[PDB]
Structures are given as C-alpha cells and as structure tokens.
Design a protein around this ligand. Structure first.
Ligand SMILES: Nc1ncnc2c1ncn2[C@@H]1O[C@H](COP(=O)(O)OP(=O)(O)OC[C@H]2NC[C@H](O)[C@@H]2O)[C@@H](O)[C@H]1O
Length: 508
C-alpha cells in the first residue's frame, strides 16, 4: 500500500476550513507595511507610509538606505547608501565587475569573502546567451529594485526579537526589494564574525552563496535567479505574513486526557507538493533558514530556495528559543527541483496555482520548528528532551483562540531525523501527541520509507483502538526511558520503543 490510515480526502485544508479573516489592520502586535484601504486583487500594493521613515535603533532592522548607514572615509563619515548607488549602477560584463561592486561598500571583507562560485557560475557553468541575459537583464533589474528600497520599504521593520508575539505583513514586492539588497550584500551590521548586536540572528547578506566550488552552488544560484528574474520582470501583487509565536503555558503532558486525532501516513509524496492547504512543517534550525545562504541543502534550505520569500525572515527573526516558532503565511513557490542534498538540481520555473486569501496571501502556511540536534541516540529519550520536543511541536501546531473545526491538518514527516540524528518512530509519536493536544490531524510523509509508514500506522491504530490518551502514551515514553535508557551503559538499548510499548500495553 502507498498510504495508510484516514483517507487524505477526509483531512482539513485551507482556505475552505478557515474562519473569515478579520479586516487587516496595523496594531501593537501586528506591523502592516502597505495601505490596507487600497489592497486590491491584481494590484501592486501601495506602501504605507508614502515617504520613507527611518528608525536606526535596537528594535528595528538597520536599513542600507538609512541616513545613519555611514562609513568612515580615510578621518570623516560618508553615506554608505550613496556609495552603494555608485557601486551598483555600473554595467557588468564579467563576474569580476560584480565582485568589485559588492566589495566597494564591504572593504573590510575584501580578503575574507570568496567569490569563486559566482565567477565559476558565470564563466564556467552558464552558456554565453544565459550569461548575457544575466548581466544585461537580470542583474541590472535586480540593482534597480534594490536601489528603489526607500520608495518600497517606507516603514521601519520591527525585529521579531526573543519572546515577542508579533506579526509583520508586507508585500511580495517589498520582499523582492529587500532580497535584492541581500544578494548585493547591502545590509549593515550583518557581516562581522565578532558581531554583538546581530549575533543572535541568521545571516542575511548572500556572500556565502558566492563561496567555494561546491557543485550545488550552480543549482542554488539558478533557483534564486529564477525567482529574481520572475519578480523583477513582473512585480508580484500578494502579501506575506511572518509571525513569531512564544507560548507561556505548556501542557502537563502526563495528565493530558485528550484522545489521539486522525493520521494519514504515506511513503510517497512531499510536504510541499501533497500538503496543499495544510500546516506545512519546516524542519528548521533555531537560526531560521539554516544554511540557505551558505552550504545547507536539506529540507529547510530546499524550501527556502523554492519559496525565496521565506529567506527574508532571516533579516528580522532572532534565534528561536525552546518555546518559540515562526509561522509564515503567503510565500509563493517559484521553482521546482529534483534530488536532495548533493543531488539537488533546479528543474524549472513553477507557476504557483494557490488561491489567495482575503489579505491577498497565497493559501500556504509554513511553520519553522527546530528539533534538537542529538549527538548520541539515547540522549533523546531523556524526559526533559522528550518534553522539549513535545512543547516545540505543540507551539508550532497550536493557534490560540481558533477552534478545532477551523484547523487544517498538519503536513509533516521525519522532523529532526536526518541531519539532526533523531529517531523517526519516537518523533512521530511526539508529533502525534503534540497534534492531539493542539486538536489537529496529522498527515505524515515518510519520504520513501515504506516500513516506517507501516510502523507508524500500526502503533497509531493500536493506541487509538485502545483509547489511550496523550497522557497514557507520554507515561509509556517515560517508562521506556526508565526501564531501557536511564542506566543503559551501552550505545543502544536492549529493546526498541515500539515493541516496548506494545508489550507494556498488552500485558497490563
Ligand atoms: N520535502 C520533504 N518532504 C518530506 N520529508 C522530507 C522532505 N525532505 C526531506 N524529508 C525527510 O525529512 C528528513 C529530515 O530532514 P532534515 O532536513 O535532515 O531535517 P532535520 O530536522 O533532521 O535537520 C535540521 C537541520 N538541517 C537544516 C536545518 O536548517 C537544520 O540545521 C530527511 O532525512 C527526509 O527523510
């Protein structure tokens, strides 16, 4: 069988399961950077305010176009934005031109940043006609949208700092201008290895994409240039929302009397293609987006590449703490891919068919939740660590003050179980428990592992038929830790989690 459990057709999906969205309006906990009174289907949003307003402080993005973005001139102060304009407005005919341009306003990194991948992409991968299109058309249009920034991003953008429950809704056009700036590496205070202020934020400037000779760089660049060509040729018209969510109160899991919810589990398909209208899980790093702007190319980075609007979260999203997540609604898919990791390839341009909601956001909700990175297998069965993963997933899944009927299914899979070393069977149970507490169903993609599909299905049906509650199951996990893990002095326990559970339940 290719899938097991509840038929997928019986699962909830947006926009049809959603409550009617309230009127989009700015408030204390929601920054909105466009004219809501003028928001209209098929029209490019109008920025609010009309003219550029600048904040250069501890609580906001430091814009490249700030009048406070200054550089010491050899002993005076000069405008970095003027320097950027001067640098980027020359014609490029060879890759060195682009490097020299970028380095003019990054003089301190002129020996630290490597541009080999950029040069090799342009000179040694691209055909002549492709190179020419790059430097005659794509790059100069990217410069122009980048330098429009003060006309496009007129409103200060608040940092989504630790412990803030806050949303930012901006236009895709606004995101394009900002991401063109990141490509040209124009964001100040985001470069130094010994940086203090932004040391708790991810990289945003794209310099590490131009590094080294990994054969995956041409594929990353092609995916991004597909995006940049699309958004500079024709301005996108939708909005995107970025929400930091920090929960205070977490369940007493051992006491949770909620029953398990429904499961569909399948070894075919992916979260992004087959999770339409469902809460899509991003298997995140705490620094959101992971290595997308450097050498990362697994689940999170592939999603950030094919939906590049995700990357901008890096500009304003502080490292996630154990009780936090980031929820992004409205990103658009611009590319298709084949492969994964060192076999990843840009396939072709994608024409996103998603409907938009009443706020003109693509009906695509993605949550970044970072699992723990386990160095040793048994580490993950320690109860503090099991509880941490439950609470993380719960925060990702829970939507405060929304009823169950209006909650889509969760589209997830092997969270924390590739690069992060987790056990899939344990995490699957953890996600099922968290989903149950949040009152959502689970659509679980095993990414080609048919045996894991059967195993997750069988356990889930076994616990459901026996009517075990979230608490009953969590207690079983604690039992497995005490009996099989706590003073197991060897690398692997004597018996595995699922057989333990079956035996513990049937003999009771
Ligand atoms: N598109 C897609 N759909 C479903 N399942 C997938 C997909 N891509 C990968 N997978 C499965 O999910 C598994 C976990 O993916 P991975 O990217 O390794 O997630 P981790 O949580 O272990 O790693 C997180 C870290 N890597 C990048 C992040 O920024 C973190 O640094 C992986 O081994 C596959 O079995």
């Amino acid at each position: 069988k290719k899938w097991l459990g509840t038929p997928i057709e019986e699962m909830r999906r947006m926009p049809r399961c959603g409550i009617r969205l309230p009127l989009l309006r700015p408030s204390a906990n929601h920054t909105v950077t466009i004219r809501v009174d003028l928001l209209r289907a098929g029209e490019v949003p109008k920025p609010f305010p009309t003219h550029y307003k600048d904040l250069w402080d501890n609580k906001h993005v430091k814009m490249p176009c700030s009048e406070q973005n200054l550089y010491p001139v050899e002993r005076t102060a000069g405008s970095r934005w003027e320097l950027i304009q001067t640098a980027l407005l020359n014609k490029f005919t060879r890759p060195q031109n682009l490097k020299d341009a970028i380095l003019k306003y990054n003089v301190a990194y002129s020996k630290k940043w490597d541009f080999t991948a950029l040069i090799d992409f342009w000179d040694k991968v691209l055909e002549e006609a492709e190179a020419q299109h790059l430097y005659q058309s794509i790059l100069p249009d990217m410069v122009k949208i980048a330098l429009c920034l003060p006309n496009i991003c007129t409103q200060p953008i608040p940092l989504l700092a630790a412990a803030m429950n806050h949303s930012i809704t901006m236009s895709q056009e606004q995101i394009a201008s900002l991401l063109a700036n990141a490509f040209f590496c124009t964001f100040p205070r985001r470069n130094a290895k010994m940086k203090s202020e932004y040391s708790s934020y991810p990289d945003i400037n794209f310099n590490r994409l131009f590094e080294g000779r990994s054969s995956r760089k041409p594929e990353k660049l092609k995916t991004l240039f597909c995006y940049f060509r699309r958004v500079t040729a024709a301005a996108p018209t939708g909005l995107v929302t970025f929400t930091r969510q920090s929960l205070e109160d977490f369940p007493e899991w051992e006491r949770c009397e909620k029953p398990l919810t429904r499961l569909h589990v399948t070894y075919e398909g992916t979260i992004e293609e087959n999770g339409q209208g469902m809460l899509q899980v991003d298997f995140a790093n705490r620094f959101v987006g992971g290595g997308v702007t450097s050498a990362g190319l697994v689940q999170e980075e592939i999603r950030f590449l094919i939906n590049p609007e995700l990357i901008i979260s890096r500009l304003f999203t502080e490292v996630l703490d154990h009780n936090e997540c980031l929820i992004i609604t409205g990103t658009e898919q611009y590319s298709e891919y084949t492969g994964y990791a060192e076999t990843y390839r840009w396939s072709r341009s994608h024409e996103d068919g998603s409907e938009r909601d009443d706020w003109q956001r693509r009906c695509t909700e993605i949550v970044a939740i970072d699992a723990l990175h386990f160095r040793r297998y048994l580490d993950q069965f320690v109860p503090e660590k099991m509880r941490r993963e439950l609470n993380k997933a719960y925060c990702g899944f829970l939507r405060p003050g929304v009823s169950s009927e209006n909650l889509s299914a969760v589209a997830t899979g092997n969270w924390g179980c590739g690069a992060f070393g987790g056990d899939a069977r344990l995490k699957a149970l953890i996600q099922i428990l968290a989903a149950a507490a949040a009152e959502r169903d689970v659509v679980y993609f095993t990414f080609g592992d048919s045996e894991l599909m059967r195993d997750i299905y069988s356990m889930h049906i076994f616990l459901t038929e026996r009517k075990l509650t979230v608490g009953d199951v969590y207690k079983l996990l604690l039992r497995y830790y005490n009996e099989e893990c706590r003073n197991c002095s060897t690398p692997g326990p004597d018996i595995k989690l699922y057989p333990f559970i079956y035996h513990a339940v049937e003999s009771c």
